[PDB]
Write a protein that binds this ligand. Structure first.
Ligand SMILES: [Zn+2]
Ligand SMILES: [Zn+2]
Ligand SMILES: [Zn+2]
Lengths: 84, 164, 224, 291, 213, 98
């Protein structure tokens, strides 16, 4: 049922599951010749590339976190802090 | 038994005490005998504890028992795990057994692994009972070709129209 | 039989542990929101030893030529003697250490001091003491306000829950209670200065590290 | 192809029972002729012959998700799967006015009524009512057993029901009397049970009314499913039709009864092969047993 | 002989009730709670050595502190009876007394048991509820026990906040039976919620909740 | 051995590896595309794709509708349930009318 960009009580940090699903989702696109958003300083491996995009905060994706009751928060891969 | 107790100076010292170990249980009645410390009385029959002292005490005693069984082989297991077990067995106000209780459930869906060569009967009741499948299991979501709302699938991913 | 009974319990984004129906099993996982793989047995010092030992270790009385911080442990050591305003700060800390000891002696009636907790503080310090090549000869450039207020602020940053209401804020203070007891006993002023000998730089590093490791120790929603 | 219909994933599944009304409200054909004909395999249902025609929903034998058929039963028949259920409800409700045999006036009943498990509560209420053999009029209060409390005004005696194959038989008394309980009496008694009463049982006033355990309108599975089933449907049709041809031209009582128990034998065996003689349940025995 | 020690039990039990009533939020002097044996003997016995239960009964009033959260908390009427076995005639007298003098709660402390007849006499004067206890199950205050954490009754107000911030249906909360020794101790009623604060080897304290079934 | 049994699945759940679990347990059955009413969760939608027309008589529906991909073995098992007079409502929403 959505929650305003303010009032999100969920973690500002990205969960290890989100990192894995985003990296896997992005890697799949890269593996199907989908446009890339960074400078492949040699990388030719999709996942390895996707990992580079993440580090460079250039993955235009949004994670919709659901709460047990149905409501939900929306964070952008951009926002999410990546420390694991 | 040796008992670690604070000494008047502050450091823990051992204070051996006499204790009684019985064969047979009757908590409600012995607890009331004069001369004892009704505050420390115990019993490995967590069932009796839960009936005399209540579910919360029943829960603690149940943790202390599961715990002793694992510590008997010297094995160590972080609290949260046994704590979680003991809470599930306790959530409904009473001591709910783990070793398969119901012939149809324990927390599933009329969709997960069709149990019995007569799953039809599990469905028949679900129908007549207006059962509502949450679809959080791995099986029910496999039948549906979707990925379970667990771990890596406990959220949805979407395209972001913000990125410049 | 065990798997079957628990298989559907998961941690949700509200740090709650629930089952397929959405029923609450634990209001916070493990009663501390911590991930088991990030917890280490650590010694809760404040709990053992005589009282004489407790006071000798933690008591800092600026108003007493004897139970003060020797001007050698600290740079501002001689000009802090008799300082009333600071002494009020040092008494908030000591009374807090004394409650902690009482409190702990209730939770572990046994007297046992080593319990698995997140963030190995003793290690973070040993790093600091090697990273900043801290020589145990020269006095420290730490202020009493630096330590007492610093360590007081750190606690407000060790988050497990974020909800802005009163209910969740209390849940949060509870979840971090035992850990903070360990914290305050490791970063007690006399300890920092006379035992660790941290500099204002090493110390500030130790703090932000604990905050990092701590948050890195919280369980992630989605955990089966 | 393409459908403006937004794509999504199933999040929940609400199980329930198909009332005779909805079975009509959603079907396409009325299905008469037990033998393309407007009776079976076309009156709207999924098509064959590589023909796109299939209710304007065109498409083909590979995009077309079979459409459902309709088919009225001369008489109501028990659904094989709920006979055990239908029996127990009868042992809880009065078989005359449809009122639960024990109210909130009985302390042991209050405890049972509190259970939240539609399965365990049903079990508890049943174990308590199958005892009562009279739809009580007055009952002792919470005060003096000297004072009585009134309730559902119907003192009639309750029957001890037993099961004989696909029929339920009851024995009354105040030497007993034995009269088989027709599907029409049960169907009507159920429809006389209150929302509070069947809900206290494991029923849902929206998705699963007791009355629906009794089949009136049977759903005809589209081509993609049924072929043998179509045969079994054919005979169900036959038996249903020969039964109506015993009313339009009147007929003896035992004759209209042999035909009812004939249809009953098919509507039953159609869904489950496990009765007096020798299905969908079966189809699953390799679709439930193969999945 | 017996009587002597038999007196102590009734006395201990008497204590538990004071402690129990006090824990419910009724004004009671920690002083009376600690009424020494020998005084109890004098302050309540007749000249023979036997205890006169009739004399022990008493009324109890909410505390300013208590009515600030639970305004509808009337007063109590604890009651002890000389009749070892209580019959409908004896109970009616009681069920009437509490009702008459308009008491919101009556606790009946019987000795060996009551007539299954009189037992049904209980629910009969709504909303005022009546509660029963067997002295035996009062001779020791279970709440004083090691494994028994602090149970605190929540006001319907604290309850709404609870259900709201965790965003739960009442059914998703951990449960506690109506007949759970502690619920019986606190006088819990179906629907009420208790906050349980327990020590934890993990965190310092951890509060959980259980709603009465 | 060499199988992927209940115990293996439990380990993968513990790892939170859901997409691997989906990839591994799923069968061959063609991902079929069905249409559904948002009111009743049934496969009683008549789709005139070319004409953009969706109808679900019994409900008066043309706007409140969705599309889902499910193994054909599912479409069947469900229709079979409908044949046995049972209603397997499929809903895209988790938060009921509560
Ligand atoms: Zn079609
Ligand atoms: Zn009747
Ligand atoms: Zn519809």
């Amino acid at each position: 049922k959505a929650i305003p960009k303010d009032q999100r009580a969920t973690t500002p940090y990205m969960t290890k599951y989100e990192r894995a699903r985003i990296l896997g989702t992005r890697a799949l696109q890269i593996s199907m010749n989908a446009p890339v958003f960074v400078d492949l300083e040699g990388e030719t491996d999709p996942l390895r590339i996707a990992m580079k995009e993440l580090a460079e905060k250039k993955i235009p994706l949004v994670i919709r976190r659901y709460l047990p009751d149905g409501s939900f928060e929306d964070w952008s891969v951009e926002e999410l802090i990546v420390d694991l | 038994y040796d008992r670690k107790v604070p000494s008047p100076t502050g450091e823990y010292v051992k204070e051996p005490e006499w204790v009684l170990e019985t064969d047979g249980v009757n908590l409600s009645e012995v607890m009331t005998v004069p001369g004892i410390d009704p505050t420390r009385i115990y019993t490995n029959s967590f069932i009796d504890i839960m009936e005399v002292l209540g579910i919360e005490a029943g829960r603690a005693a149940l943790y202390k028992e599961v715990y002793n069984v694992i510590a008997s082989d010297g094995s160590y297991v972080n609290y949260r795990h046994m704590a979680l077990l003991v809470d599930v067995m306790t959530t409904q106000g009473g001591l709910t057994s783990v070793t398969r209780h119901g012939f149809n459930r324990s927390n599933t869906g009329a969709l997960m692994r069709c149990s019995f060569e007569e799953t039809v009967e599990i469905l028949f009741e679900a129908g007549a009972s207006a059962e509502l499948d949450d679809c959080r299991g791995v099986s029910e979501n496999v039948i549906l070709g979707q990925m379970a709302p667990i771990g890596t699938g406990a959220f949805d991913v979407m395209i972001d129209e913000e990125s410049l | 039989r065990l798997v079957k009974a628990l298989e559907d319990i998961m941690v949700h984004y509200d740090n709650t542990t629930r089952n397929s129906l959405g029923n609450v099993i634990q209001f916070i996982y493990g009663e501390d929101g911590m991930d088991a793989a990030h917890i280490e047995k650590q010694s809760l010092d404040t709990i053992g030893g005589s009282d004489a030992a407790f006071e000798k270790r933690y008591r800092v009385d600026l108003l007493n030529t004897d139970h003060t911080l020797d001007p050698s442990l600290l740079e501002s050591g001689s000009e802090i003697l008799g300082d009333l305003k600071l002494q009020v700060l040092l008494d908030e800390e000591y009374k807090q250490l004394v409650k902690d000891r009482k409190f702990l002696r209730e939770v572990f009636v046994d007297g046992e001091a080593n319990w698995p907790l997140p963030v190995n503080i003793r290690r973070i310090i040993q790093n600091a003491q090697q990273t900043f090549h801290i020589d145990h000869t020269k006095p420290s450039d730490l202020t009493i306000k630096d330590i007492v207020l610093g360590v007081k602020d750190l606690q407000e940053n060790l988050l497990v829950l974020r909800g802005k209401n009163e209910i969740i804020q209390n849940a949060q203070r509870d979840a971090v209670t035992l850990f903070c007891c360990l914290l305050r006993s490791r970063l007690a002023t006399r300890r920092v200065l006379q035992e660790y000998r941290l500099t204002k730089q090493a110390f500030d590093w130790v703090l932000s590290n604990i905050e990092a490791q701590f948050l890195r120790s919280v369980v992630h929603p989605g955990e089966m | 192809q393409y459908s403006s219909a937004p794509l999504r994933t199933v999040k929940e599944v609400q199980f329930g029972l198909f009332s005779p009304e909805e079975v009509r409200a959603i079907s396409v054909a009325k299905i008469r002729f037990p033998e393309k004909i407007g009776g079976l395999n076309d009156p709207r249902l999924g098509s064959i012959d590589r023909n796109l025609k299939c209710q304007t929903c065109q498409e083909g034998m590979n995009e077309c998700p079979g459409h459902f058929g309709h088919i009225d039963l001369a008489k109501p028949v028990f659904h094989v799967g709920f006979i055990a259920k239908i029996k127990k409800v009868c042992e809880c409700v009065c078989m005359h006015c449809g009122k639960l045999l024990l109210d909130e006036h009985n302390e042991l009943m209050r405890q049972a009524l509190a259970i939240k498990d539609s399965k365990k509560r049903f079990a508890a209420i049943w174990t308590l009512c199958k005892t009562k053999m009279v739809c009580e009029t007055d009952v002792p209060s919470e005060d003096d057993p000297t004072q009585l409390v009134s309730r559902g005004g119907c003192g009639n005696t309750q029957p001890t029901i037993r099961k004989d194959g696909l029929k339920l038989v009851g024995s009354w008394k105040k030497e007993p009397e034995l009269r088989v309980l027709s599907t029409e009496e049960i169907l009507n008694i159920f429809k006389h049970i209150s929302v509070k009463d069947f809900t206290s049982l494991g029923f849902n006033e929206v998705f699963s009314r007791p009355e629906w355990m009794i089949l009136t309108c049977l759903p005809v599975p589209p081509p993609p499913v049924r072929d043998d089933l179509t045969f079994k449907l054919a005979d169900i049709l036959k038996a249903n039709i020969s039964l109506e041809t015993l009313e339009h031209n009147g007929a003896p009582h035992h004759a209209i009864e042999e035909a009812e128990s004939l249809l009953q034998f098919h509507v039953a065996t159609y869904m489950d092969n496990d009765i007096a003689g020798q299905s969908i349940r079966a189809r699953l025995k390799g679709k439930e047993g193969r999945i | 002989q017996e009587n002597e020690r038999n007196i102590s039990r009734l006395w201990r039990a008497f204590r538990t009730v004071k402690e129990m009533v006090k824990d419910r939020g009724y004004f009671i002097t920690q002083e009376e709670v600690e009424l020494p044996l020998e005084d109890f003997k004098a302050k309540y016995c007749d000249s023979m050595g036997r205890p006169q239960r009739k004399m022990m009964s008493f009324q109890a009033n909410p505390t300013e502190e208590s009515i600030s959260k639970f305004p509808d908390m009337g007063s109590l009427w604890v009651e002890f009876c000389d009749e070892p076995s209580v019959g409908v005639k004896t109970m009616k007298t009681f069920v009437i007394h509490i009702q008459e003098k308009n008491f919101q709660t009556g606790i009946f402390v019987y000795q060996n048991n009551i007539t299954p007849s009189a037992m049904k006499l209980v629910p009969s004067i709504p909303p005022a509820t009546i509660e029963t206890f067997n002295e035996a199950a009062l001779v020791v205050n279970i709440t004083h026990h090691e494994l028994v954490p602090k149970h605190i009754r929540l006001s319907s107000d604290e309850k709404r906040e609870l259900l709201k911030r965790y965003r739960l249906k009442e059914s998703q909360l951990p449960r506690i039976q109506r007949a759970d020794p502690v619920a019986l101790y606190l006088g819990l009623k179906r629907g009420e919620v208790v906050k349980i604060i327990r020590k934890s080897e993990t965190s310092g304290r951890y509060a959980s909740y259980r709603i009465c079934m | 051995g060499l199988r992927f049994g209940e115990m293996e699945r439990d380990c993968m759940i513990a790892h939170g590896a859901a997409s691997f679990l989906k990839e591994r347990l799923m069968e061959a059955s063609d991902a079929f595309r069905v249409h559904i009413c948002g009111i009743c969760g049934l496969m009683t939608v008549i789709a005139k794709l070319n004409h953009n027309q969706f109808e679900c008589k019994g409900c008066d529906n043309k706007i409140d509708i969705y599309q889902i991909h499910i193994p054909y073995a599912a479409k069947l098992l469900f229709q079979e349930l409908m044949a046995m007079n049972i209603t397997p409502r499929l809903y895209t929403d988790r938060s009921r009318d509560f």
